RNA sequence: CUACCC
RNA sequence: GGGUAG
């Protein structure tokens, strides 16, 4: 207690200044008014100063115009909550119709003239605020639009008014330009890179007017991309803005445009990792079913929100025990999530996208200074985001020496809160202090214990997803023979017993059964738990009237809607979003539950564009209903791809294309052009006359030329795709060659495997003297094979690994592949491999089939090469179910070896390396999987892992030649697991033939056959391989060359050489379509072409009818058009604001499905799902259909982009 | 169901 | 068979 706090608050509603910086202030002027604030107007700008060390991020853009004279700000702070405050607006607003008076078009001028006052509200707020930047355009006709107040634009045209100086000020924030024209460059600045991609180009070994075209085309596209001329206009992108103008009468003199906190840089700051570290510096000095509780921590950056968390943690370690950035601590009763809140926009994008939802926040206020002006944004940002509970707390409540005084800091926020509706006069606050907390005062501990003992009760029990009335997303439908009609999909909410009534509503007049039953796989169960995958029974309805994306809840629960409100986020340009913003009519898909359902939108007053990377709030109105309530997460597909998500926020009332266009192309689709003899070959040789090279002469030397491994990465480049491109042409004429040829080889693939496994039975040679490399490796091979596998595979990882899948099966073919058709289908299992059926049979209550027990697999040939075929091998059905089991824990437990199969990046990345590096090599054995006998096979594997390799595998084999054959080889090409297993065979000598040379194993990875190891360990694991049975392949395995290749990518010193091979009779256009697009992309950078095959593209590009060349998509899309800048296409059509285009697709008549399997097949995923920008969690699999493919092309419209 | 590939 | 984009 010093002078009276009565009129302190005079000295705060007079000033509103700080209120512990008044009674210091007052207590420094002995009772009086005037010279109180006299001390707080210099001692208040020594606190503006101060801030200088606060980085300003945020703020406004303010713009203004008279008559036709424009000018633009970019005054800012440091945080939204400021920015978006009738405060920072009275400023930042005044100091705009200060430019208006007097055109101010000079920073410091203004910075100046506002410097009295610029500390006013520092001293009242508590940051850097401060203009940043300011600039005026004068034109014929300007105007100006802006983007809420993140970005403003200033345009000045000459014939245009508000129909366009408004829109192309919406290109200028939507598309951000840097100059008006391709015009607007600085020479220096344009033969920077006109001679940094020089040698780039000439580095490669292109001739000058090669390297000189590209680059100079390149950058007539790179100058053409600022260009505000050629940029496609953002409301109808058809065209070019520059375009636009010369259509329309109009001409642009220049234009302005400001981005808040651009160029500010700056480090990020990650608030959970922060307080891992406020924790620290004060550390040195059963029960899993309790509720979970989102708290969130909201209040200003200098009242140390940081500091009190610290404290809600160590002091909560203390007592009970203690999306990233958020802390987890516990407490006696329940569980919390305590996120930080600093953002308002930042937290938009944490309710909406759901990556941090709200059960009650707390608000952190320092009582030294009580609330401040952008406290009421803070508070906004609660009831404008629905937060239901909001706890206060004063933090650093030593610095106040009168409680009287402490009080009225109450009724500065318990009005605060009354005025948006939140309990202001019953709500809890504690005062007391966090950095007294993080110290060991218990006094103040108390209050930390105070405040953590109000999230236990004021807060309300979340109401467990299990208590939550019944509701079960529909995700497929079966009609089973004997069990009514089932319908699957993992519970959301809610029990389900077997009998209870219930409501089938999605699309239709919701209409209502009872349940018969529900089951599982293994179980049949009679409850249905939430949260739990299930498949429920209905009586008296049948698969034609329940469509997906339905749901299944308890009667009158959940009501079918198709019109209401909704707010958004979406998806930036760098988070797969579209980079285009739309406007009013845009038509997107919003995926629901489990299907996705179209329908249009509106903007709600005053907004007309959109971008991605925007919070939005808007009216969604959908084509048919879907059941739903507050709080559905609904995402936004485009075309297939998500560029938005939202949740439901209130239910209302309820509420381009040219068709002959995509016929006339499906009859131009199906046109089976026609070649004078080899298409291939001339496409070829005209393209290698295009390189200089010469050209093939007769159909031999396609597949007998041997590249040259010197020159110019160039001069290698194209004469390399010359013995590669044509490899794989099956349609040779006078090709003596067979498939034959690959049967004789699979001969020796035994007979080589043969002389191994007898051979390889003999440890000790003669006597003891004579001690081979190769025996030293397998035995190393053999311990380190073992301490990463184990003694024999787990069931834990045996029965969660085992799958159906693929197509071919002994029982099956190509027609009946589908995983559906093996649950509905008995397959056949092997005398040893009986066992493990028998298991599965006893692992549930559905019916397990086997048609013959046999020991036999059927082997066949599939087409390889020009010159020889394959020998894959059809394995038994069950044979091959549990294969893929072992195969899928052999291949994770692969990993610790740091080898990845599902990641074959990892391998041609570092064929890149040793493309210059010549320190790593790549191998190619020659025959793998048929190379690796049953010996070398029993040597390394553990007995146990070698007995579930032997049940399981295939012992007899039946030809086409009728001839059957016992396998030598351990297991063939297409057996269920044989790929793990050599990937695992090679990895382990390899290793073995790195720590025998003293070198890291880890410096060793293999994918299947193509390994790749340290260069040295070459000629020794290459001798290793000579005794273990293997064979490498001299032509395929590099460790001298400046050429790599792995994983199909092929390198050259560090250049990308990977070439593209002609494959099957080119006839239909789908075949050209696709050959023009790989030639394409070996011969492009960015949409500029490599001249020189440019020419045979243009050329060949004349074969195909005639809109099916102006009918271009962006790659990455597929081969169902040429490959092309899309802007272009006539046939795109702009519909709902998002590009369309036709694409050829593969015709297909559908057949029936066999319901049976199908659903086995169900609930056999929803088993190994059990056991196995953030927000692709709202999407699942898909149902089961098969569709036979006929023979006709279709025409699929699909959604496309810029680039 | 369509490219690429071990 | 298997990876990987549609
Ligand atoms: N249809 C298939 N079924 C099973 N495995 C296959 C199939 N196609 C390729 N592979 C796998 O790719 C690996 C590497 O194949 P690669 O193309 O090197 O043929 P290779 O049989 O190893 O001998 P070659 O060098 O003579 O081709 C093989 O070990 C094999 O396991
Ligand atoms: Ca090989
Ligand atoms: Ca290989």
Same mark, same amino acid.
């Given at each position: 207690?010093?002078?009276? &706090? ?37 001692? =208040?700008?020594?606190? #503006? ?99 809420? #107040? ?24 939507? !598309? ?97 990792? *922060? ?110 985001? =629905? ?22 800091? *109450? ?88 009998? *209870? ?129 507050? =709080? ?20 209302? !009332? ?63 480049? @194209?004469?390399?795709?010359? &013995? ?45 003297? $004579? ?147 010549? $320190? ?49 080889? @351990? ?233």
């Amino acid at each position: 207690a010093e002078i009276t &706090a009565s009129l302190v608050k005079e000295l705060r509603e007079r000033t509103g200044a700080g209120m512990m910086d008044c009674k210091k202030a007052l207590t420094e002027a002995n009772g009086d008014i005037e010279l109180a604030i006299e001390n707080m107007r210099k001692s =208040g700008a020594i606190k #503006a100063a101060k801030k200088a060390g606060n980085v300003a991020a945020d703020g406004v853009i303010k713009t203004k115009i008279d008559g036709n004279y424009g000018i633009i700000l970019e005054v800012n702070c440091q945080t939204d909550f400021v920015a978006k405050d009738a405060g920072f607006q009275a400023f930042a607003d005044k100091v705009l119709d200060a430019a208006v008076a007097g055109k101010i078009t000079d920073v410091e001028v203004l910075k100046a003239q506002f410097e009295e006052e610029r500390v006013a509200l520092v001293a009242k707020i508590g940051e850097n605020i401060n203009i940043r930047r300011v600039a005026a355009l004068e034109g014929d006709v300007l105007g100006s639009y802006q983007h809420g #107040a993140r970005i403003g634009v200033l345009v000045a045209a000459k014939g245009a008014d508000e129909e366009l100086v408004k829109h192309i000020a919406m290109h200028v924030a939507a !598309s951000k330009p840097e100059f008006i024209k391709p015009e607007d460059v600085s020479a220096e600045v344009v033969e920077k890179e006109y001679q940094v991609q020089l040698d780039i180009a000439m580095q490669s070994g292109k001739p000058k007017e090669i390297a000189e075209k590209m680059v100079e085309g390149r950058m007539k596209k790179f100058t053409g991309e600022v260009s505000l001329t050629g940029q496609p206009f953002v409301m109808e992108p058809s065209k070019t803005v520059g375009q636009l103008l010369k259509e329309h009468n109009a001409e642009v003199t220049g234009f302005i445009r400001f981005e808040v906190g651009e160029g500010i840089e700056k480090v990020e700051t990650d608030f959970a990792a *922060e307080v891992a570290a406020m924790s620290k510096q004060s550390h040195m000095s059963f029960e899993r079913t309790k509720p979970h509780v989102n708290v969130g921590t909201i209040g200003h950056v200098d009242h140390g929100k940081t500091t009190l968390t610290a404290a809600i943690t160590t002091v909560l370690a203390k007592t009970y025990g203690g999306n990233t950035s958020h802390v987890e601590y516990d407490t006696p009763t329940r569980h919390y999530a305590h996120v930080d809140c600093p953002g308002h926009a930042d937290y938009v994008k944490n309710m909406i996208t759901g990556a941090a939802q709200m059960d009650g926040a707390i608000l952190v206020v320092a009582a030294t200074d009580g609330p401040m002006p952008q406290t009421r944004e803070h508070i906004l940002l609660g009831r404008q985001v =629905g937060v239901p509970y909001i706890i206060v707390f004063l933090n650093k409540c030593d610095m106040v020496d009168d409680e009287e005084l402490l009080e009225l800091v *109450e009724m500065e926020v318990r009005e605060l809160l009354s005025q948006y509706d939140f309990p202001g006069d019953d709500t809890p606050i504690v005062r007391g202090s966090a950095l007294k907390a993080l110290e060991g005062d218990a006094e103040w501990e108390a209050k930390i214990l105070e405040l953590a003992g109000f999230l236990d009760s004021y807060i309300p029990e979340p109401e467990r997803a299990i208590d939550k009335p019944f509701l079960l997303p529909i995700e497929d439908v079966f009609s089973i023979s004997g069990r009514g009609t089932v319908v699957t999909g993992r519970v959301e909410r809610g029990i389900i017993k077997v009998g *209870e009534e219930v409501e089938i509503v999605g699309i239709k007049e919701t209409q209502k059964s009872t349940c018969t039953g529900v089951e599982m796989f293994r179980k049949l169960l009679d409850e249905g738990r939430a949260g739990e995958n299930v498949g429920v029974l209905l009586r008296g309805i049948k698969r034609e009237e329940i469509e997906r994306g339905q749901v299944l809840a308890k009667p009158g629960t959940i009501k079918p809607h198709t019109k209401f409100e909704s707010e958004v986020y979406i998806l930036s340009k760098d988070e797969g979003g579209r980079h285009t913003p739309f406007f009013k009519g845009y038509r997107p898909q919003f995926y629901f539950r489990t299907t996705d359902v179209t329908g249009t939108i509106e903007l709600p007053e005053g907004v007309e564009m959109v971008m991605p990377g925007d919070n939005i709030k808007m009216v969604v109105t959908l084509i048919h209903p879907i059941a739903m309530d507050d =709080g559905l997460r609904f995402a936004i597909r485009e075309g297939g791809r998500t560029v938005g998500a939202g949740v439901v926020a209130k239910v209302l !009332s309820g509420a381009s294309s040219r068709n002959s266009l995509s016929a006339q192309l499906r009859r131009a689709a199906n046109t089976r052009i026609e070649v004078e003899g080899n298409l291939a070959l001339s496409i070829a040789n005209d393209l290698l006359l295009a390189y200089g090279q010469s050209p093939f002469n007769s159909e031999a030397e396609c597949i007998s030329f041997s590249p040259r491994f010197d020159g110019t990465p160039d001069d290698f480049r @194209i004469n390399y795709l010359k &013995a590669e491109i044509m490899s794989k042409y099956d349609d040779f004429s006078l090709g003596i060659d067979t498939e034959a040829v690959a049967w004789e080889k699979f001969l020796a693939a035994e007979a080589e495997c043969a002389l191994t496994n007898a051979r390889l039975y003999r440890p000790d040679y003669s006597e003891d003297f $004579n001690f081979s490399l190769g025996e030293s490796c397998i035995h190393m091979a053999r311990r380190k094979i073992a301490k990463l596998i184990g003694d024999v595979p787990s069931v834990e990882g045996m029965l969660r690994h085992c799958r159906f899948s693929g197509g071919a099966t002994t029982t099956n073919n190509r027609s009946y592949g589908h995983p559906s058709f093996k649950f509905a289908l008995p397959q056949a299992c092997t005398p040893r491999a009986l066992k493990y059926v028998l298991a599965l049979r006893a692992s549930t209550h559905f019916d397990i089939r086997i048609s013959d027990i046999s020991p036999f697999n059927k082997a066949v040939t599939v087409p390889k090469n020009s010159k020889t075929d394959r020998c894959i091998a059809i394995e038994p059905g069950w044979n091959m179910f549990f294969q893929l089991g072992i195969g899928g824990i052999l291949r994770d437990r692969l990993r610790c070896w740091g080898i990845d199969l599902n990641d074959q990046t990892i391998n041609q990345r570092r064929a890149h390396e040793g493309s210059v590096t010549n $320190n790593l090599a790549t191998v190619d054995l020659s025959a793998a999987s048929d190379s690796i006998s049953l010996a070398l096979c029993e040597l390394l594997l553990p007995p146990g892992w070698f007995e579930v390799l032997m049940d399981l595998r295939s012992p007899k084999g039946r030809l086409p030649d009728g001839s059957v054959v016992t396998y030598e080889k @351990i297991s063939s090409m297409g057996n269920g697991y044989t790929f793990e297993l050599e990937s695992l065979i090679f990895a382990s000598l390899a290793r073995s033939v790195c720590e025998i040379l003293d070198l890291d194993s880890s410096e060793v990875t293999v994918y299947g056959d193509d390994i790749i190891l340290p260069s040295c360990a070459v000629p020794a694991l290459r001798e290793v391989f000579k005794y273990v049975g293997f064979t490498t392949n001299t032509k395929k395995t590099f460790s001298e060359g400046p050429f790599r290749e792995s994983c199909g990518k092929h390198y050259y010193s560090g250049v990308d050489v990977t070439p593209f091979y002609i494959r099957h009779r080119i006839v239909s256009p789908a075949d050209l379509i696709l050959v023009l697009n790989n030639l394409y992309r070996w011969a492009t950078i960015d949409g500029v072409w490599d001249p020189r095959a440019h020419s045979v593209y243009l050329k060949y590009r004349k074969l195909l009818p005639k809109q099916l060349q102006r009918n271009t998509i962006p790659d990455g899309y597929g081969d169902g058009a040429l490959v092309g800048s899309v802007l272009i296409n006539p046939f795109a059509k702009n519909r709902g604001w998002i590009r369309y285009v036709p694409v050829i697709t593969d015709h297909t008549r559908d057949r029936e499905r066999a319901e049976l399997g199908s659903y086995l097949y169900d609930l056999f995923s929803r088993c190994l799902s059990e056991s196995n920008a953030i927000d692709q969690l709202i999407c699942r699999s898909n149902p089961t259909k098969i569709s036979r493919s006929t023979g006709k092309f279709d025409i699929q419209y699909i959604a496309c982009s810029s680039r």
